[PDB]
Each structure stands twice: as C-alpha cells, then as structure tokens.
Design an enzyme around this catalytic site. Sequence first.
Site, PDB file in Angstrom:
ATOM      1  N   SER B 197      38.958  38.158  41.058  1.00 33.18           N
ATOM      2  CA  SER B 197      40.399  37.976  40.880  1.00 33.18           C
ATOM      3  C   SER B 197      40.975  37.730  42.269  1.00 33.18           C
ATOM      4  O   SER B 197      40.543  36.827  42.970  1.00 33.18           O
ATOM      5  CB  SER B 197      41.012  39.111  40.014  1.00 33.18           C
ATOM      6  OG  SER B 197      42.439  39.076  39.755  1.00 33.18           O
ATOM      7  N   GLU B 324      39.326  34.341  30.135  1.00 31.11           N
ATOM      8  CA  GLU B 324      40.123  34.835  31.250  1.00 31.11           C
ATOM      9  C   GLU B 324      41.565  35.119  30.895  1.00 31.11           C
ATOM     10  O   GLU B 324      42.207  35.921  31.551  1.00 31.11           O
ATOM     11  CB  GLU B 324      40.164  33.792  32.392  1.00 31.11           C
ATOM     12  CG  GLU B 324      38.785  33.403  32.952  1.00 31.11           C
ATOM     13  CD  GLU B 324      38.265  34.428  33.937  1.00 31.11           C
ATOM     14  OE1 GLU B 324      38.778  35.545  33.960  1.00 31.11           O
ATOM     15  OE2 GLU B 324      37.351  34.099  34.688  1.00 31.11           O
ATOM     16  N   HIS B 437      38.696  39.087  31.519  1.00 34.68           N
ATOM     17  CA  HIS B 437      38.842  38.945  32.955  1.00 34.68           C
ATOM     18  C   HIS B 437      38.585  40.333  33.505  1.00 34.68           C
ATOM     19  O   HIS B 437      39.184  41.279  33.045  1.00 34.68           O
ATOM     20  CB  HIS B 437      40.294  38.494  33.196  1.00 34.68           C
ATOM     21  CG  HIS B 437      40.730  38.378  34.638  1.00 34.68           C
ATOM     22  ND1 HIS B 437      40.611  37.270  35.397  1.00 34.68           N
ATOM     23  CD2 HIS B 437      41.459  39.343  35.380  1.00 34.68           C
ATOM     24  CE1 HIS B 437      41.261  37.533  36.559  1.00 34.68           C
ATOM     25  NE2 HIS B 437      41.782  38.782  36.572  1.00 34.68           N
TER      26      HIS B 437
END
Lengths: 528, 528
Positions: B197, B324, B437
């Site tokens: 991330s 995601e 995610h």
Amino acid sequence: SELLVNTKSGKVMGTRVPVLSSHISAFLGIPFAEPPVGNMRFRRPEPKKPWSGVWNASTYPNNCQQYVDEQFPGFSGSEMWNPNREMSEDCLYLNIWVPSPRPKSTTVMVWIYGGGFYSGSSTLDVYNGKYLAYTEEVVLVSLSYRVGAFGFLALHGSQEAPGNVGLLDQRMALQWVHDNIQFFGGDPKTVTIFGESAGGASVGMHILSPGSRDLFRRAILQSGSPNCPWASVSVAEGRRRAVELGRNLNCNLNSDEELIHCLREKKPQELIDVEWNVLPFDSIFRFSFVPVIDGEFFPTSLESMLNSGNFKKTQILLGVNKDEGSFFLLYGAPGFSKDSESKISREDFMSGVKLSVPHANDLGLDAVTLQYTDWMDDNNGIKNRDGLDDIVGDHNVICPLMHFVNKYTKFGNGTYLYFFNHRASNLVWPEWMGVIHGYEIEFVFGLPLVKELNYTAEEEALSRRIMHYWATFAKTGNPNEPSKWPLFTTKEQKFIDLNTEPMKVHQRLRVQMCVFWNQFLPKLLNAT
Amino acid sequence: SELLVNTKSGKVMGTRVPVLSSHISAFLGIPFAEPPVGNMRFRRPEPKKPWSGVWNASTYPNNCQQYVDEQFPGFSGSEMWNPNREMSEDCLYLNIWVPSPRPKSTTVMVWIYGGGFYSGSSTLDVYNGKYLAYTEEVVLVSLSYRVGAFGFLALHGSQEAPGNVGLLDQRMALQWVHDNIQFFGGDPKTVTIFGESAGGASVGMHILSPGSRDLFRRAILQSGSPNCPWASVSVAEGRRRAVELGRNLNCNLNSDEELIHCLREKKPQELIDVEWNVLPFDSIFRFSFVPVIDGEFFPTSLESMLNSGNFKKTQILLGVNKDEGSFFLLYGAPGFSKDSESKISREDFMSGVKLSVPHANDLGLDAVTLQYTDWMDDNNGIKNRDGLDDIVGDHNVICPLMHFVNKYTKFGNGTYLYFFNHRASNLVWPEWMGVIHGYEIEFVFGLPLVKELNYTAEEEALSRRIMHYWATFAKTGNPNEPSKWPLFTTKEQKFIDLNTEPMKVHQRLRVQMCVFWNQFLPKLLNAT
Ligand SMILES: Nc1c2c(nc3ccccc13)CCCC2
Ligand SMILES: Nc1c2c(nc3ccccc13)CCCC2
C-alpha cells in the site's frame, strides 16, 4: 383478357411467363411518369399522359444511368448487380408479376431496390418476382427511380433541381400502384413496400414523409434505415456537392440557372464520370448524391421525427445480415482483396477505421480502436480484418437500425426483427466476407427454388420460410401463421436468427457495441 | 553478548523470543532520530544523539498518532490493523529480528508499513518478523514514520513544515540500518526494502529520490506504486489542504508562521479529528496529507523521472491482489455492507463510480461506465458490485503499477511480477470482498506457520514458497533458486499467479482495462 388489362392510364398487354412447372402473367415496363429527359432532367417527375392502344408490357425497361461496376469484370459476384439492360435517362417504369388465374383482390408487395443511391435496377435476376408471386400468390411490383446526380442533385431553393427527386419518383410509382393495382387483382389497402440497402432506407423515408404515409400499409426494411449516416445530407451539403460537381465539368457557377443549364447539356456519362469526385472526404460507405433533409419531403430532422412519433404507425419487419462491412472493405479499404484472406496489419487497420469514421476526430478514432481491438492480441491480422468488418457494419447498418427500431416501437403497431446469418453454399465471394450485404435477397426472391442454381435442399427450405414470413407479414401484419417469431419490445428486445437451423430467439441485438455508437461516440465528438 | 550489541549510537540489549520450536533475538524499539515532539513537530527528523548505558530493546515502541479505525469495533478483521500500543508523537523507532546464532553478514529486509499515509504501525502482529527471520535466516527490520498531518503537512516554502517529512523519517531509518546493521550480522550492501500500500508506494519513491537511491539494493512493492493517484500532491495542493486544516482549527491564517505555531499548540487528537475534512472532493481511495512533489525529494514530476530513467536501476519484485477495491467500497461506498452480499443497484453503481473517479468529468464517468457495464445485463446487482470492485482496483492499484513496471523495465536490472489471488480459508471478511487489499501480508510474514491460527496445510506450503521467493530475491535478485517465475519483459509481459495451485504464468496483466486507464481516460479528460 388475363393478359389484357385496362388501367386508368391505358391498356396493357403482358406475357405469360413460366414459373417452375406452371405459368404466371407478367407485365414488364409499364410507364408511370413522363420520361425525365431533356429540360426535365433534375426536375420532379410528371404523371404520365395516358396512352391509346395497348402498351406492350412484354420486355424489361431500360435501366437508369448509373455507374457500372467493373472492379472484377466478368465476375458473377459483382456482375449480378450491374444494369442488365440498356441504360437510358428514360427509365421510369414499373413491372408487375401477377398470379394465374388473376386473383380478385390480394396482397401487394412493391420492391424498392438498393444501390447506395447511385445504382440499381429492377430488371436484375435477383429481383425477378415470378417465384414470389407464384409461391405466395401475391401481386409483386418493382419500381425504378433515378439514382445518382440525376435523382438526387439538390440546389435547394430551386425548382429546376430541388432535391429528393428520386424519392418523388418512388412516390409516383406508389401512387400509380394505389390507383390501378385493382385492375391486376391487387388490394390497394394492403400493399407492403419492401427494400434493401438504399431501398430499405427509402422505405423508412416513406414511413416518415407525410406525403407518402398514405400509399402503403406496412413496410419491410432490409439492411437499411432512414437514419443511417449515409442516407441523407443537409441542404447545405447538397448545395456544396452540387456546385462541386459543376466545377468538375467547368460549368459556370455564377447561378443555379447557369449551373443547372450547364449540367443539363452534359451527356449523362460525363456526370457519372466525375460523380465520385465531389465527396468531402476519404471514406467508405458514403455516397455523394443522396436525399437531402429539405423541409418538404422531411418536415424536420429525422431525429425529431423519430423522437416525436411523427411517422406512420403500422407494423414493420426489418433486419440485418451478419457481415455488412465486407463488401465495402473489399472494395475500398487497403489490405483487402478478393483472392487473399485479407489479414490486416495494424497499419492498414488504423487506415481502415479512419475511412469508416470520416467524421471522427483523433479522440473519436482512438475511442473506436479501444472498443474494437483485442488488446491482448493487438497485431493479429485475422482479428484486425474481422474487427474492421464490424466497425463498418455496426457503424453504418446495425447500430442506426437498432436506433430506428427502438424509437419506432414506442409508437408503431408491431415490430419483427431478424438477423440473417447464413452463407449460401454456392457463394462465389471468399469465405472471409461471410454473410454479405445484399446476400439475403436471393432467399427472399426464391432463387433457391431454381434447382439449376445449385443450392442445397436445406436452403430451399429456408427461402420458402423466408418467403412465407414475408408474404404472411404483408397480408396479416404478423409473419407467423396462426415457432413464433416474437415481437420486438423495448423491454425484452427479442429477435430471431434466420438461418437453416432450428430458430433461436435472442435478445438485445448488439447492445454493447451499439450503445457505444448510439450514445457514447456522438457525445464524445460533441464535447470535443 | 548475542543479545548485547554495540552500535555506533550506543549499546542495546535485546530479548530472546521463541519462534516455533526455537528462539531468535529481537531488538525492539531502537530509537533512530530525535523524538519529533514540541517545536519539532512538522520538521524534518534529527539523527538521534548517542546514548550511554544500554538501551533496553525488549518491548515494542509507541505507535505514531493516527486515526483509530472503529467502524467495526471489536471485529478482528479491522482491529488487526489498529495501533496495538500507546500512540505518542515520540514514535520514531525501529525493530530488528536477528537469527540465533547471530550471522556474520547476511541479507537484510526492511519493512515499510502501509496505511494510506494516515495510519500504520510496525508493532502489528502481521508484521512480526520472527517467522521470516527464522525460516529464511535474514535480518529483518521494521521502520516507523510519521503519518497524517504530523508527517505530511506541507507549507512548501517553509522550513518549519516542508512536506515529505514522513518520507525523510524512512530515509533516516534506512541510514541507521546502513550504518549499523553490521553489528547485528547484516550486510549493508544487501538490504532490500519491502512495503505494501503506502509502504509499497514509499519504496518506489526511494527508488526515485536521488537522496535515497544509495541506502538499499533491491526493492519489493506490494499493491503500491509511487505513481498511484493517491500517493502524491502538488505543492499547491498541499498548501491548500494545509491551510484548510488550519481553518478547521480556527488558526490564524495570515502567515505560515502563525498557522504552524497554531498547529503546533493543538493537541494531536485535534489534528486527527478534522484531518479527513480537508479533502477537496467526495472520494474513495484518496488521502489528505500525502507526499508532495516538492522539487527536493522528487526533483521533477514522477512521470518525467519514469520517462527519463532517472531512477535507481536494480531489480524489483512487485504485485497486486485480485480484489483491491473491496475494502474501500465496503468502507465508504453506498450499498456495501459487511454482513450483506452487497448487490448494488444502478443508482448506487453510478454513485460509486463518481466516488472512484473524483476528477472525471461527465464524459469521463460515461466512459468508465461504458467499459465496466455489461450492457446485456445492465441492472444485475452482483455484476454491479463486482464491476465497482474492479473500477477501484484497476484505477487505483493495478493500472498505475503496470505503468510503473513498464517504464521501469526499460532500464532496470530485472523485474518479477505476481498476482496474488488466494483467499485465506480463515478470512473473517465476507466472501464478496474476495482477495482483499492487505491480505497477502499474512503469507509473506509466515503467520500460516502458526498452527493456532487455523490455516490449511496447503496454505502453510504457500507461505513457505512466498517467504522463500521473497528471501531468495532479497539475496540473489531472482526469486528462483537455481518452476521458474519468468522475468517480466516489455515484449512478453509474463507474471505468475500466487495461489495454492500449480503455478501458472500468464501474460499482459489486465491490458484491456489498463489501456483504458493509462492511455484513453487521460486523453479524454484532457481534450475536454
Ligand atoms: N453492387 C452490389 C450491391 C450489393 N451487394 C454487393 C455485394 C458485393 C458486390 C457488389 C454488390 C447489395 C445491394 C445493392 C448492390
Ligand atoms: N486498515 C486496513 C489496512 C489494510 N487492509 C484493510 C482491509 C480491511 C480493513 C482494514 C484494513 C491494508 C494495509 C494498510 C491497512
């Protein structure tokens, strides 16, 4: 009598023609307007002065002047569509195939030929109505109308050359049919106009034009739609092309009078020779002299008319063929050729799309490529060939037709839609072209019934179904005799496949692609 | 010794931690910069003054201040990511897990945590490096860096609050590692920075920033890319948000001095409370205080840098997870909810895309819908849920990452790409969210090895493969020990699936969609 008929214009003698194992009556070449020659060139057609005597209606009439296609001289696949009779300016006549014994009152089918507005003949063998007239017992007629400059030149504010004259010729023939088909056994209150390509677009133009709505009941549109991009131009554009033609013949362009006189002195072929020069851009599937939105024939833009219900409300039967693009690509896109399997490179691919979307801007072209390219196989020549074949088809025939259908269905009295996707076993064009534009007409006219033409028995079956659907729809207004060919509804947009298998009903003919062309593309181009 | 280490800053005492069936040494909480409290808030970090004595490195440090997530209080699925230690402004420390016996010189892996730049902790259990350090025998460290206002406020022409301070904190820790990992058995010439991330985006930012290129060898980027739209803002924007924050606390906005002093007096929580108010638009997957392209850390725009090769050239290993978008949708898009299967209506669908593409104009939004909607099934709630999940993912993580990869591969020294698409059997989030995610990190850190956590044996196998690939790549520069995980090449863009089955190599990860976002969309938006 049988072959002798008195019409309100005069008497006519026909011929008995063999049909299969029997005979029929045929009246070929009946005049329907005064020959638009001389000082009448470009002018609206006059109703024909009656005649004395008997008009001999035993042979086909002359064909109107047009561009002869000689891109593949001798090749039947192209030749089958060229004027098979002497061309002449004097070509406004009609033909009628009538059953034997003559019926009392029966359905009538009037065929309006295609040809991108620059070509067409009623005398072609794939338009010989003997088989339809016989097998379905209907009266069938075929019109003639001026194409090209001769029928669509349009110096708007002029009486000498207003536009849409070829369109008026159609109307005049519709009138004569209305006023005299009874003497041939036809019911004037049950005539269906059918047509393909420009013919199908003309049909929809009659459904729109106030002046013609009353001379026909139902209509059939094959691979054509009045709103197709290649079927009309504004008065401004027509003027532009009209003058541009004038300069190619070095006419005095100081006035419409001069321009027109000039063009009236040129021999017909001179006009044809420079006819394709006046287009405003390099393009495919675009014609020069076409109907103009003049405010008379069409009161307003076709889009308003469609949006307001300003059109005849009856039921229609229409459709598309699987590979509408082929012919156009093959004839004028770089990379395609008849004896090759035309694998297109990305270079020629991009060249192709530019030709298909002559009005798109860079972004627009980009948008088209996005949709039609398989990004995970970018350079595949087969895929590129096929993608182009769908760009042309969706942009020029399928998507505008679906637009028309949706706007008509809101207010019409029934809609039947087909997708013709059968390749005749004896097709002489290459396999890559698939189900070509123009190729369902063999079926609708019953040529498969002629065993000498070499079609399979399964195809014979197919044309009989087609011919029945066409006939039954013309009489009843529904193609099904009492599986059902569903009605098209805006809700559940059903249509059927028209090929030799067991019928399949499908839904939403080409939605994905069509929303792109009918809703996205236009916005894009407008915002930019 | 073993647990006693002399570093150039002072001595440190660690702890022996159990790992599986054995032990390891752990040094937690070693300070690496002077506590950025008081008048140092917003300022760049100072190197830490050495200390006398032994620093006790037996417990985790405090976490930096951040927004605690309490959207599902008590729920482990969310809680696992919240600060599990006292938050404090004094939070710049690092942790190191070292094998036993201490190695002489071995590879080093430095973990930079994610959290959209507003959250993150190094002390989380899914970032406990004992398993990796042990199973692969590497030295593993974890940084801490200021997030939020505290780390990314950016009143550009100011020394008191230049931007990117959190970025500098990372660097400082990279420096300390460079200058002292040797005393722990690590080889300073073989440290790999890995992150997810915002961490993965930070990693790529070090590959770009001249000042950091030299403190690391290779890099791993997980679901992040420096060029992702949510990872940076211009100096202008940062100023804008900086001041906007100021007005939410009613600070005097007559000067940066006043503004800054003001913000330095506010208690940390006040800043967090109004932190999410300063965004310029309703949006999803967008953070407020993020890295600014200031001309120092980044000399030029990241796009020029990518286009010119102005970056460190080593080999990288990067990837994406299948779903995601899920987390973002679930947390702030209307229609999604944790205990429902979130079928979205076309209304909420369109509301969603507006949130996902905050910068698109009407035409842009239209363009997105075109691509992501199944026109032949327009109103399908499942399809709409899923389409939105791909809009967010492709727009915000997959497509920018593929962009980075392509521009880096031209000049890097090797590239390995993965697509993680395995859903842990014990996932507590709903099935609709899929492969979320953040969810590969459990694998990379070897939590499946802990039998008490309930993973299947097949998953245990999977994390060992992952951990090996990660370790072997960190040492060698290729994840494969001498099937092969192909190199990514601009030609034949190969990548592999990372799930429990037999490995599959694929090509061109999401081309179709990615050309839309990377090439079409931007043009569209620019032309309009
Ligand atoms: N000349 C042609 C016409 C049609 N199709 C054709 C197909 C191939 C070659 C020439 C053609 C469709 C109807 C109009 C005329
Ligand atoms: N807080 C979360 C973070 C991540 N995923 C999450 C997924 C669901 C709920 C909260 C999350 C990925 C890494 C950054 C933090």
